[PDB]
Design brief:
The structure holds 3 protein chains of 3 kinds. Chain A is mostly beta strands. Chain A has no helices and 7 strands. The termini of chain A are far apart. The termini of chain C are far apart. The chains are: A mainly beta, B alpha/beta, C mainly beta.
């Protein structure tokens, strides 16, 4: 309903959860070290659907994924967990 | 799996759980989970228990927490999460718990604190955040908390504190920030902390004294050390009156204000070290609760006389490495116990200086210029156990009221030569006195450092009666037979051949060695049973120098004259015109013996090693200054004439040796040199003994043979000559004829 | 705030003993703790301490181990191969300020004291 701090997260079995490139309300996506030249992120607020695309992926770094949302305000974007109120169930990509 | 306490308390330790335990009573009050392997917290994990009060998650590797997982725990009070693997402060799943009391987040690698964190907690009192990797203080989340008491941020990586950091914390009591990298402090950084009692800033990189502390009105305990503070401006502690403890050490302090420490009504101890340029005593008006005072390294020259008229409860006092010259009276004091004054310019002691101190135990006045001590100094001083005074020019040492002493050190007072009365020091345990003979009075369980061994005896110089009579025997006959032989060789009014005058000089040198031995025997006879009393005076006086010079001179002339005798014989045979040549050579050798003997005299302490005044035995450390040189010269010469006589053996045959009177002279010289060789081997061996670590002999023994094996030649050379040269019999008849003609 | 100790007792010479102390509260600084020895007729002395390189006394060097477990907030001191001269009363002391090794030979600095235990070696 309220578009604010959409994010995506990757989780490998037996370790922590880290973030990948995330976009804010005004665009200007914060982009992680391993995603430039690899992944593309887009988001339409007409229906509030975000799309991700894969390009030339390597066999490793294939793990479970999640999408994360937040409706509050007052905190800067940092591509870091523990700031998103709502979490998706996720999906395994390999 | 987990035992039930029965009081609604559940404990789980190392049972390998990867998920939240289930099936327990819903009424449980406290829950502990420690050393398991839970890594993630699923959503609605704790929705089962609605009456949980205290929550422990210790040591497992939790990394992700669902925001809704912690919901429903409205009565939680204590939350502990240490040594786990979280990377950021969980701003979510914490806002729900309104009634939280204590929160502990230690050893977790945390770098960023979200802005909205710590919001909605209205009654949090304890928050622990240390051993993390924080880099800047979370000003906004800290301001969000109005009721925080104790704050610990240690071992983090903070660099500087911005202004107005802690404005909204009204009820903060203690603040810990040590081992950080703080280097600058704003003048208004600490405003608002009116109820702060304890402030810790240790091991930081502060380069200048902070000022914001003057805003704190109730700061009890203050600690900073290992910093880089170097200057203490005056009026620094003006703002805060009540200061029980001030920590400061390892700082490179240079200047301290005259009035800095003034008006502290509750300070307990004061320590200042390394403050070199401060040269005037601090003004201590108003400070009347100082147990311990310490100032070191300064340039203070005088002490005020109202000092412990003000300080009524001073217990210890140390002032060293200063320029104190005079001591004011300490009569007012009563609780003073230990006093240390070292490396100062004190030169006199008066009676009244130490009068009235009832409970003084340990007193130290070392490395000073004191030469006058009043007799009644220490008379009415109370029970004193350990007293140290050393390395000062001191002439006489009084003893009045020192019966209770236990430790007494006096070393370096070479001017002090008076003996020490044994009766006065009844309970003395450990001594240190400059000369070893003084301890012979105690004859010690008393411990005296100086060895006072065999080499420095107490009762008899010579020791054994057999040794005494033996040296008396060779002394006498050496003297008598030397006089006889010199009278025979010189009194005859005949032309003097080179060999005859040579053996005459041999006799003269041996006679000198003999009366050296005689003077030693006279000293031993005079000082029977009481050598300890005479030892110091004998060694310090010129008699020891004279005796040692005499002995050394006698021993070199004999060796050189013998060597010159056997080359004289060799070339006499070969030409068979050098007589005047060798006469002045003999004179030149005598002069060399003179200078070799007198050379050590200009040095210091070389002839005072032993009461016998002979340096060749040496001692603990003679450190071979010239002993090795002398033995080297002696050995090289002996091998030289050994080679010369082997060459003579090769050149001249045994039948000619038997049939030649000049060769009879050669045989006599060979006997002389062989005897000199074997009788000098032992002293060289003894001098070589300390060089080898394996070989050790008791001072008992080395003294005996050094005494016995030194002067023998002076005895047997004349005996050998008269027993085995009819040349002497011919001269005896000549002198008998001359005596008969005269009479 | 409150400190409790456990251990102690009578042991023949050359044995091994473990002493465990627990603490409750938040004002104390967990980087300054110590074990203190007291024999009758003498003042308290500092046997060992934790500073921030543990500080060990002259005498007990090589036979005494000191450890801290912040997982359960417990201090452990284990001794082995005791000499009879070790028979004394033992105290656990905690300060309020951070401390170095130099602070440990003077007890007066420490504030929070425990009730103590008794250990005798024969």
């Amino acid at each position: 309903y309220s578009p604010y701090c959409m994010g995506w997260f990757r989780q490998a079995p037996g370790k922590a959860r880290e973030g990948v490139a995330t976009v804010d309300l005004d665009g200007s996506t914060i982009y992680a070290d391993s995603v430039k030249g690899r992944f593309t992120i887009s988001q339409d607020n007409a229906k509030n659907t975000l799309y991700l695309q894969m390009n030339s992926l390597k066999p490793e770094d294939t793990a479970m994924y999640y999408c994360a949302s937040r409706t509050r305000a007052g905190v800067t974007c940092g591509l870091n967990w523990a700031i998103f109120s709502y979490w998706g169930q996720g999906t395994q990509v390999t | 799996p987990c035992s039930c306490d029965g009081d609604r308390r559940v404990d789980c330790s190392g049972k390998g759980l990867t998920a939240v335990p289930e099936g327990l009573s819903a009424f449980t009050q406290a829950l502990d989970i420690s050393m398991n392997n839970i890594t993630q917290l699923p959503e609605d994990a704790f929705a089962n228990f609605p009456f949980l009060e205290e929550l422990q998650l210790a040591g497992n590797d939790l990394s992700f927490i669902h925001p809704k997982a912690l919901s429903g725990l409205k009565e939680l009070k204590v939350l502990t999460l240490q040594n786990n693997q979280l990377k950021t402060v969980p701003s979510e799943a914490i806002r729900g718990l309104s009634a939280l009391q204590s929160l502990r987040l230690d050893a977790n690698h945390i770098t960023s604190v979200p802005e909205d964190s710590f919001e909605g907690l209205v009654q949090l009192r304890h928050l622990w955040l240390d051993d993390n990797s924080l880099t800047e203080v979370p000003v906004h989340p800290l301001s969000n908390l109005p009721t925080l008491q104790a704050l610990t941020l240690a071992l983090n990586k903070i660099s500087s504190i911005p202004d107005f950091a802690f404005t909204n914390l009204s009820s903060l009591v203690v603040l810990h920030l040590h081992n950080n990298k703080i280097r600058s402090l704003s003048q208004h950084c600490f405003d608002g902390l009116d109820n702060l009692e304890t402030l810790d800033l240790n091991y930081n990189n502060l380069g200048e004294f902070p000022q914001a502390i003057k805003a704190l009105p109730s700061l009890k305990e203050l600690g900073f050390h290992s910093n880089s503070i170097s200057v203490i401006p005056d009026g620094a502690f003006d703002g805060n009156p009540l200061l029980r403890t001030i920590h400061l050490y390892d700082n490179p302090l240079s200047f301290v204000g005259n009035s800095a420490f003034h008006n502290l009504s509750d300070l307990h101890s004061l320590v200042i070290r390394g403050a070199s340029m401060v040269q005037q005593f601090p003004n201590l008006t108003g400070t009347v609760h100082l147990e311990s005072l310490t100032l070191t390294g300064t340039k203070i020259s005088s002490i005020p006389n109202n000092l412990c008229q003000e300080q009524k409860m001073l217990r210890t006092l140390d002032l060293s490495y200063n320029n104190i010259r005079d001591l004011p009276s300490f009569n007012g004091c009563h609780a003073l116990e230990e006093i240390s004054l070292q490396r100062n310019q004190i030169y006199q002691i008066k009676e009244g200086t130490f009068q009235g101190l009832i409970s003084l135990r340990i007193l130290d006045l070392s490395r000073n210029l004191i030469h006058e001590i009043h007799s009644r100094a220490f008379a009415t001083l109370g029970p004193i156990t350990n007293l140290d005074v050393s390395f000062n020019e001191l002439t006489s040492f009084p003893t009045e009221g020192l019966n209770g002493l236990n430790q007494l050190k006096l070393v370096g007072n070479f001017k002090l030569k008076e003996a020490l009365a044994a009766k006065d020091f009844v309970n003395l345990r450990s001594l240190s006195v400059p000369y070893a003979y003084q301890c012979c009075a105690f004859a010690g369980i008393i411990h005296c450092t100086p060895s006072t061994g065999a080499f420095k005896p107490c009762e008899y110089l010579l020791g054994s009666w057999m040794i005494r009579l033996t040296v008396w025997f060779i002394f006498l006959v050496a003297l008598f037979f030397n006089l006889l032989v010199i009278l025979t060789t010189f009194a005859s009014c005949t032309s003097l051949p080179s060999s005859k005058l040579f053996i005459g000089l041999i006799s003269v040198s041996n006679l000198f060695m003999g009366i050296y031995t005689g003077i030693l025997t006279f000293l031993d006879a005079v000082s029977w049973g009481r050598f300890a009393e005479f030892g110091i005076w004998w060694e310090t006086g010129s008699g020891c120098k004279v005796a040692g010079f005499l002995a050394v001179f006698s021993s070199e002339s004999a060796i050189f004259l013998l060597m010159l005798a056997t080359v004289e014989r060799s070339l006499s045979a070969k030409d068979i015109n050098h007589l005047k040549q060798f006469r002045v050579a003999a004179l030149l050798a005598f002069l060399g013996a003179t200078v070799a003997g007198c050379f050590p005299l200009f040095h210091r302490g070389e002839y005072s090693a032993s009461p016998l005044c002979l340096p060749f035995p040496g001692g603990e450390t003679p450190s071979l200054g010239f002993t090795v040189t002398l033995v080297l010269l002696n050995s090289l010469a002996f091998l030289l004439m050994a080679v010369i006589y082997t060459k003579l053996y090769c050149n001249l045959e045994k039948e000619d040796l038997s049939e030649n009177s000049q060769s009879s002279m050669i045989k006599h010289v060979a006997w002389l040199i062989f005897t000199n060789c074997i009788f000098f081997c032992p002293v060289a061996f003894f001098s070589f003994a300390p060089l080898i670590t394996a070989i050790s002999i008791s001072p008992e023994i080395m003294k005996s043979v050094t005494l016995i094996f030194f002067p023998l030649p002076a005895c047997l050379n004349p005996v050998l000559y008269v027993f085995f040269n009819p040349k002497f019999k011919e001269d005896w008849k000549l002198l008998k004829r001359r005596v008969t003609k005269k009479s | 705030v409150a400190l409790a100790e456990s251990g102690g007792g009578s042991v023949a010479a050359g044995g091994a003993i473990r002493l465990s102390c627990t603490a409750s509260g938040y004002t104390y600084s967990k980087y300054c703790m110590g074990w203190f020895r007291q024999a009758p007729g003498a003042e308290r002395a500092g046997v060992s301490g934790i500073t921030t390189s543990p500080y060990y006394a002259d005498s007990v060097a090589g036979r005494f181990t000191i450890s801290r477990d912040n997982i359960a907030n417990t201090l452990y001191l284990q001794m082995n191969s005791l000499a009879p001269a070790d028979t004394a009363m033992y105290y656990c002391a905690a300060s309020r300020l951070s401390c170095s090794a130099a602070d440990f030979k003077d007890f007066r600095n420490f504030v929070y004291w425990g009730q103590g235990t008794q250990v005798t070696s024969a």
